[PDB]
Ligand binder design. Structure first.
Ligand SMILES: OC[C@H]1O[C@H](O[C@H]2[C@H](O)[C@@H](O)[C@@H](O[C@H]3[C@H](O)[C@@H](O)[C@@H](O)O[C@@H]3CO)O[C@@H]2CO)[C@H](O)[C@@H](O)[C@@H]1O
Ligand SMILES: [Ca+2]
Ligand SMILES: [Ca+2]
Ligand SMILES: [Ca+2]
Length: 545
């Protein structure tokens, strides 16, 4: 329940704060900005992976689960971070990455060392077929999901990069070692986990070929490994052996789960996590189809209420483009950022803020493929260019869909590198840091930052915004997303003009008292309650008694 009332903040540590001038974010950098997060009103910090890693996938390829990434600092730095976070009245959850390890993990170095060795079946090995890979599966990062090992003459599976071999969850020995490691972290007193790629741990037995109607080189392979039957056996055991033993929060990153099939994932009784990140609203690739967005988020609001589950609320993370670009408007950047904030943050659930979201940071456009880092898009570029795609065609995909958009340095001020670093940043800063930064926004009472500050405050001050029941209003309005939160004798009315235009809207009224809790436009003198005249991306929240 503390995790129900919590507001969470996600840190991408490589890009949060550099404290020693090598252009790479680090743990002492995070410590140095804890005031910012405490003052914002954050309850829980989720930090992206900080473990020993070759960084083929920036921390998600782990070579030692119990050692800190050299770029980021030492275990002593981590211990200091956790101690400072806890003394500041905040909690910290770690990123648990146990679908796969680095290919430089000791387990894998042993596993690949000989066809027969005790660690061989810690990973997923198969001999080729017809002088090719064991099957036609594509990696999520493009190319084959199998990599050949010359020494042992067999392929190993990798859903993600070539340097992220999948762990074999059918091996009891693997599972036991993973559980020990998880509990080792929980014994230090961290407050839980965000659980990475967790819907991918069950593979269809025998790894059969997938249908290939378009005759591709490799077939997108989600139907072979994403949320496959049999996965719950593993996740139930994971919960029993680790999470259930501690008072923590878990949020699983669970692609391939829909609102009608979320029962085993998040139900109050028997669910294997407290909440999950679901992906259904994050794949609407214009004028945004607002009503489709209403349908999806409402499905999840209603769906989880029915089974006493809990939603994880979010519009941004390190895997997505910026939400002003995705869901709002660069033509109305500050207004749409606040509209989007009120929209997603005040539904029933635990809201997450991704670093820079609270500033209205936006997508970047670098001209050189060398300026980017994302292993997924670097692979895409190589593969598609060979196929004939032009540089422009490919950069359009990277600019418009690439997750590097969310990994540019956090924009603290207008000093060199937006104050992220004294050196040369691992990833270039967005030039718009001269306009978009924490320092500027702290001083402006109508900043995006201070709007998030207010959102956090009203949610904490009014129980209806935490536990109140959601109901969608005005479903058929293609511009206005409106909904209520109802708890006993209090009703909150959230009104979001999700369009770049002025709109009229009839107040969806029966109250003894009405109060405006938040608004991103000045209130108009002569405007009547009944007849809303909303500016582009105007949002208002009313509290009704
Ligand atoms: O540790 C590897 C990788 O894992 C995490 O993200 C992955 C998701 O778990 C996985 O389901 C898949 O999700 C993307 C889908 O491929 C795509 O169709 C669409 O739904 O966007 C999803 C989000 O990107 O792949 C992602 C990795 O792209 C973790 O969060 C990643 O940082 C990490 O690289
Ligand atoms: Ca550094
Ligand atoms: Ca099994
Ligand atoms: Ca008006």
């Amino acid at each position: 329940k503390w995790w129900k009332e919590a507001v969470a903040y996600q840190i991408y540590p490589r890009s949060f704060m550099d404290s020693n001038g090598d252009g790479i974010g680090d743990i002492q950098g995070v410590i140095s900005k804890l005031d910012y997060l405490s003052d914002l009103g954050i309850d829980v910090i989720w930090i992206c992976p900080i473990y020993q890693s070759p960084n083929d996938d920036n921390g998600y390829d782990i070579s030692d689960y119990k050692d800190i990434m050299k770029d980021f600092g030492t275990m002593e730095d981590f211990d200091e971070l956790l101690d400072e976070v806890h003394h500041r009245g905040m909690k910290l959850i770690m990123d648990l990455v146990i679908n796969h390890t680095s290919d430089e993990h000791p387990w894998f170095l042993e596993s690949r060392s000989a066809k027969e060795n005790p660690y061989r079946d810690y990973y997923i090995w198969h001999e080729g077929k017809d002088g090719k890979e064991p099957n036609n599966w594509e990696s999520i990062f493009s190319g084959s999901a199998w990599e050949f090992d010359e020494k042992t003459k067999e392929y190993y599976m990798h859903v993600f990069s070539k340097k992220q071999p999948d762990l074999n969850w059918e091996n009891e020995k693997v599972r036991h070692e993973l559980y020990e490691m998880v509990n080792w972290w929980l014994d230090k007193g961290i407050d839980g986990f965000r659980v990475d790629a967790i819907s991918h741990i069950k593979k269809v037995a025998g790894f059969p070929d997938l249908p290939n109607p378009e005759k591709l080189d490799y077939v997108p392979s989600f139907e072979g490994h994403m949320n496959r039957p049999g996965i719950q056996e593993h996740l139930k055991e994971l919960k029993e052996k680790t999470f259930a033993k501690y008072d923590i929060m878990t949020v699983g990153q669970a692609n391939g789960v829909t609102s009608d099939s979320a029962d085993e994932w998040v139900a109050e009784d028997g669910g294997n996590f407290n909440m999950i990140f679901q992906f259904e609203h994050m794949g609407l690739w214009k004028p945004l189809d607002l009503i489709e967005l209403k349908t999806i988020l409402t499905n999840w609001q209603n769906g989880l209420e029915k089974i006493n589950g809990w939603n994880a609320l979010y519009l941004e993370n390190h895997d997505q483009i910026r939400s002003v670009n995705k869901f709002g408007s660069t033509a109305y950047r500050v207004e749409s950022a606040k509209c989007l904030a009120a929209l997603y943050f005040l539904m029933k659930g635990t809201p997450f803020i991704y670093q820079g979201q609270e500033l209205g940071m936006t997508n970047v456009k670098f001209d050189s493929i060398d300026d980017y880092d994302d292993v997924g898009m670097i692979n895409y570029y190589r593969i598609q260019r060979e196929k004939g795609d032009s540089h422009d065609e490919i950069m359009k995909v990277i600019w418009e869909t690439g997750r590097d958009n969310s990994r540019t340095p956090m924009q603290w001020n207008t000093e060199k590198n937006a104050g992220f670093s004294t050196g040369n940043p691992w990833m270039k800063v967005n030039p718009n840091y001269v306009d978009i930064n924490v320092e500027e926004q702290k001083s402006d009472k109508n900043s995006v930052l201070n709007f998030y500050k207010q959102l956090i405050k009203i949610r904490k001050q009014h129980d209806v915004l935490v536990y109140g029941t959601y109901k969608l209003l005005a479903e058929e309005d293609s511009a206005i997303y409106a909904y209520t939160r109802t708890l006993e004798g209090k009703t909150a009315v959230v009104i979001c003009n999700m369009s770049p235009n002025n709109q009229t809207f009839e107040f969806p009224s029966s109250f003894t008292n009405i109060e405006v809790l938040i608004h991103n436009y000045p209130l108009d003198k002569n405007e009547t309650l009944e007849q809303c005249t909303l500016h582009p991306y105007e949002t208002r929240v009313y509290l009704i008694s």
